[PDB]
PDB file of C-alpha atoms in Angstrom:
ATOM      1  CA  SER A   1      -4.406 -47.443  96.803  1.00  0.00           C
ATOM      2  CA  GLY A   2      -4.020 -45.788 100.393  1.00  0.00           C
ATOM      3  CA  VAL A   3      -4.549 -47.615 103.542  1.00  0.00           C
ATOM      4  CA  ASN A   4      -4.595 -44.612 105.761  1.00  0.00           C
ATOM      5  CA  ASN A   5      -9.387 -44.885 105.546  1.00  0.00           C
ATOM      6  CA  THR A   6      -8.594 -47.797 107.436  1.00  0.00           C
ATOM      7  CA  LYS A   7      -6.767 -47.489 110.805  1.00  0.00           C
ATOM      8  CA  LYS A   8     -10.273 -46.720 112.463  1.00  0.00           C
ATOM      9  CA  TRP A   9     -13.294 -48.244 113.691  1.00  0.00           C
ATOM     10  CA  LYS A  10     -16.840 -46.642 112.786  1.00  0.00           C
ATOM     11  CA  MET A  11     -20.129 -46.638 113.989  1.00  0.00           C
ATOM     12  CA  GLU A  12     -23.106 -46.911 111.560  1.00  0.00           C
ATOM     13  CA  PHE A  13     -27.240 -46.927 111.835  1.00  0.00           C
ATOM     14  CA  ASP A  14     -28.968 -48.843 109.055  1.00  0.00           C
ATOM     15  CA  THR A  15     -30.330 -46.597 106.184  1.00  0.00           C
ATOM     16  CA  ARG A  16     -33.027 -45.397 105.608  1.00  0.00           C
ATOM     17  CA  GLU A  17     -35.870 -43.614 102.959  1.00  0.00           C
ATOM     18  CA  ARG A  18     -34.548 -40.957 101.035  1.00  0.00           C
ATOM     19  CA  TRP A  19     -37.327 -40.098  98.437  1.00  0.00           C
ATOM     20  CA  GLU A  20     -37.533 -36.927  95.572  1.00  0.00           C
ATOM     21  CA  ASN A  21     -38.945 -33.466  96.933  1.00  0.00           C
ATOM     22  CA  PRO A  22     -41.865 -32.475  94.872  1.00  0.00           C
ATOM     23  CA  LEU A  23     -41.066 -29.385  94.705  1.00  0.00           C
ATOM     24  CA  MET A  24     -37.332 -29.823  92.763  1.00  0.00           C
ATOM     25  CA  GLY A  25     -36.618 -33.744  93.425  1.00  0.00           C
ATOM     26  CA  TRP A  26     -33.817 -33.513  95.639  1.00  0.00           C
ATOM     27  CA  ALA A  27     -34.088 -35.957  97.992  1.00  0.00           C
ATOM     28  CA  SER A  28     -35.304 -36.352 100.937  1.00  0.00           C
ATOM     29  CA  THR A  29     -34.874 -37.651 104.769  1.00  0.00           C
ATOM     30  CA  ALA A  30     -37.205 -37.926 107.643  1.00  0.00           C
ATOM     31  CA  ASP A  31     -33.784 -39.769 109.483  1.00  0.00           C
ATOM     32  CA  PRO A  32     -32.151 -37.671 111.771  1.00  0.00           C
ATOM     33  CA  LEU A  33     -28.943 -40.210 112.494  1.00  0.00           C
ATOM     34  CA  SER A  34     -29.134 -39.956 108.013  1.00  0.00           C
ATOM     35  CA  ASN A  35     -25.262 -38.361 108.469  1.00  0.00           C
ATOM     36  CA  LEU A  36     -24.382 -39.914 111.728  1.00  0.00           C
ATOM     37  CA  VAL A  37     -20.946 -41.442 111.997  1.00  0.00           C
ATOM     38  CA  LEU A  38     -19.257 -42.480 114.988  1.00  0.00           C
ATOM     39  CA  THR A  39     -14.837 -43.123 115.373  1.00  0.00           C
ATOM     40  CA  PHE A  40     -13.779 -45.355 117.666  1.00  0.00           C
ATOM     41  CA  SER A  41     -10.038 -46.263 118.635  1.00  0.00           C
ATOM     42  CA  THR A  42     -11.348 -50.427 118.610  1.00  0.00           C
ATOM     43  CA  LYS A  43     -14.032 -52.474 118.718  1.00  0.00           C
ATOM     44  CA  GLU A  44     -13.963 -52.427 122.622  1.00  0.00           C
ATOM     45  CA  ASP A  45     -14.786 -48.637 122.519  1.00  0.00           C
ATOM     46  CA  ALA A  46     -17.097 -48.696 119.527  1.00  0.00           C
ATOM     47  CA  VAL A  47     -19.199 -52.126 121.835  1.00  0.00           C
ATOM     48  CA  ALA A  48     -19.057 -49.754 125.240  1.00  0.00           C
ATOM     49  CA  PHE A  49     -20.577 -46.712 122.834  1.00  0.00           C
ATOM     50  CA  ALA A  50     -23.289 -48.188 121.362  1.00  0.00           C
ATOM     51  CA  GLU A  51     -24.135 -50.676 124.306  1.00  0.00           C
ATOM     52  CA  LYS A  52     -24.294 -47.345 126.663  1.00  0.00           C
ATOM     53  CA  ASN A  53     -27.059 -45.786 124.787  1.00  0.00           C
ATOM     54  CA  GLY A  54     -29.154 -48.714 124.463  1.00  0.00           C
ATOM     55  CA  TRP A  55     -28.005 -49.335 120.157  1.00  0.00           C
ATOM     56  CA  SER A  56     -28.317 -53.386 118.813  1.00  0.00           C
ATOM     57  CA  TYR A  57     -25.134 -53.517 117.108  1.00  0.00           C
ATOM     58  CA  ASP A  58     -23.508 -55.827 114.730  1.00  0.00           C
ATOM     59  CA  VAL A  59     -19.102 -56.478 115.200  1.00  0.00           C
ATOM     60  CA  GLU A  60     -17.894 -57.138 111.788  1.00  0.00           C
ATOM     61  CA  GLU A  61     -14.082 -58.142 112.789  1.00  0.00           C
ATOM     62  CA  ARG A  62     -11.030 -55.461 110.671  1.00  0.00           C
ATOM     63  CA  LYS A  63     -10.435 -57.094 107.142  1.00  0.00           C
ATOM     64  CA  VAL A  64      -6.044 -57.273 107.824  1.00  0.00           C
ATOM     65  CA  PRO A  65      -4.803 -57.424 104.220  1.00  0.00           C
ATOM     66  CA  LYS A  66      -2.418 -61.020 104.267  1.00  0.00           C
ATOM     67  CA  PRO A  67       1.361 -60.613 104.200  1.00  0.00           C
ATOM     68  CA  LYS A  68       2.497 -61.318 100.470  1.00  0.00           C
ATOM     69  CA  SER A  69       5.172 -62.716  99.418  1.00  0.00           C
ATOM     70  CA  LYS A  70       6.769 -61.131  97.004  1.00  0.00           C
ATOM     71  CA  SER A  71       9.986 -61.279  94.363  1.00  0.00           C
ATOM     72  CA  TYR A  72      11.078 -59.761  91.250  1.00  0.00           C
ATOM     73  CA  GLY A  73      13.623 -62.576  90.060  1.00  0.00           C
ATOM     74  CA  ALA A  74      10.179 -65.084  89.258  1.00  0.00           C
ATOM     75  CA  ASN A  75       9.693 -63.128  86.621  1.00  0.00           C
ATOM     76  CA  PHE A  76      12.416 -64.302  84.869  1.00  0.00           C
ATOM     77  CA  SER A  77      11.786 -67.954  86.194  1.00  0.00           C
ATOM     78  CA  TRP A  78      13.827 -70.645  84.040  1.00  0.00           C
ATOM     79  CA  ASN A  79      11.052 -73.328  85.192  1.00  0.00           C
ATOM     80  CA  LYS A  80       8.021 -72.265  86.356  1.00  0.00           C
ATOM     81  CA  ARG A  81       4.726 -70.259  85.322  1.00  0.00           C
ATOM     82  CA  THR A  82       5.548 -67.313  86.540  1.00  0.00           C
ATOM     83  CA  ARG A  83       7.668 -65.846  83.842  1.00  0.00           C
ATOM     84  CA  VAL A  84       6.477 -63.117  82.284  1.00  0.00           C
ATOM     85  CA  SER A  85       5.856 -62.708  78.573  1.00  0.00           C
ATOM     86  CA  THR A  86       6.335 -58.833  78.565  1.00  0.00           C
ATOM     87  CA  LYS A  87       7.420 -55.653  81.051  1.00  0.00           C
TER      88      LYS A  87
ATOM     89  CA  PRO B   1      55.989 -63.985  50.962  1.00  0.00           C
ATOM     90  CA  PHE B   2      54.675 -61.218  53.793  1.00  0.00           C
ATOM     91  CA  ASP B   3      52.416 -58.155  52.058  1.00  0.00           C
ATOM     92  CA  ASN B   4      50.550 -56.367  54.274  1.00  0.00           C
ATOM     93  CA  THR B   5      49.015 -53.348  51.619  1.00  0.00           C
ATOM     94  CA  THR B   6      46.038 -54.621  50.545  1.00  0.00           C
ATOM     95  CA  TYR B   7      42.635 -55.556  52.316  1.00  0.00           C
ATOM     96  CA  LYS B   8      42.000 -59.229  52.806  1.00  0.00           C
ATOM     97  CA  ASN B   9      37.775 -58.958  54.325  1.00  0.00           C
ATOM     98  CA  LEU B  10      36.753 -58.714  50.668  1.00  0.00           C
ATOM     99  CA  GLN B  11      34.299 -61.953  51.165  1.00  0.00           C
ATOM    100  CA  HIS B  12      31.700 -60.540  52.583  1.00  0.00           C
ATOM    101  CA  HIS B  13      31.536 -58.274  49.310  1.00  0.00           C
ATOM    102  CA  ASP B  14      29.737 -61.485  48.103  1.00  0.00           C
ATOM    103  CA  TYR B  15      27.375 -61.543  51.289  1.00  0.00           C
ATOM    104  CA  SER B  16      24.077 -62.176  50.578  1.00  0.00           C
ATOM    105  CA  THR B  17      20.296 -62.091  51.968  1.00  0.00           C
ATOM    106  CA  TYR B  18      20.286 -65.271  53.081  1.00  0.00           C
ATOM    107  CA  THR B  19      23.630 -65.411  53.702  1.00  0.00           C
ATOM    108  CA  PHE B  20      23.659 -65.694  57.840  1.00  0.00           C
ATOM    109  CA  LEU B  21      20.788 -68.157  58.243  1.00  0.00           C
ATOM    110  CA  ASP B  22      22.629 -70.349  55.939  1.00  0.00           C
ATOM    111  CA  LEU B  23      24.960 -71.044  58.029  1.00  0.00           C
ATOM    112  CA  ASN B  24      23.126 -71.322  61.141  1.00  0.00           C
ATOM    113  CA  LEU B  25      21.171 -74.366  58.772  1.00  0.00           C
ATOM    114  CA  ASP B  26      24.566 -75.207  58.328  1.00  0.00           C
ATOM    115  CA  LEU B  27      26.144 -75.071  62.563  1.00  0.00           C
ATOM    116  CA  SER B  28      22.863 -76.857  62.959  1.00  0.00           C
ATOM    117  CA  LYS B  29      24.438 -80.568  63.003  1.00  0.00           C
ATOM    118  CA  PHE B  30      27.379 -79.429  65.384  1.00  0.00           C
ATOM    119  CA  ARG B  31      25.758 -78.403  68.492  1.00  0.00           C
ATOM    120  CA  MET B  32      24.688 -80.053  70.815  1.00  0.00           C
ATOM    121  CA  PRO B  33      21.822 -81.449  72.369  1.00  0.00           C
ATOM    122  CA  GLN B  34      19.705 -78.290  74.271  1.00  0.00           C
ATOM    123  CA  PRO B  35      18.342 -78.067  77.787  1.00  0.00           C
ATOM    124  CA  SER B  36      14.560 -78.555  78.086  1.00  0.00           C
ATOM    125  CA  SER B  37      13.127 -76.642  81.018  1.00  0.00           C
ATOM    126  CA  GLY B  38      10.778 -79.669  81.198  1.00  0.00           C
ATOM    127  CA  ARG B  39       7.695 -77.921  79.729  1.00  0.00           C
ATOM    128  CA  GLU B  40       6.680 -77.236  76.184  1.00  0.00           C
ATOM    129  CA  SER B  41       6.318 -72.459  77.381  1.00  0.00           C
ATOM    130  CA  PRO B  42       5.532 -71.238  80.420  1.00  0.00           C
ATOM    131  CA  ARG B  43       2.622 -71.303  79.231  1.00  0.00           C
ATOM    132  CA  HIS B  44       1.945 -75.169  80.009  1.00  0.00           C
TER     133      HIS B  44
END
């Protein structure tokens, strides 16, 4: 339930091939950016960084949970379906 | 006369398994009509 990992903007790159090392079976890669993940305060900072470095990018708008209406009393409604059968 | 030396609550020595619910059945004809939430149950 913690939300502390959803505060900042990230920049990652497209995933590329990983294959099995013949000797050990370890995951090998030829992608030097496979682990590169950058952090930004705002999407404008992230876009600016991407533009000056020549990378083409996709921007996904931040999803924020919408305000919910909560009422403990609704659990015991006289004539509404919200009444709970167990506690 | 007046007496204060005997226990006058001996009827319950003759109560049985269904005494309470039999009385509840008798009381059914005196009750007022129940209110209604407007649905059969919270799951309707």
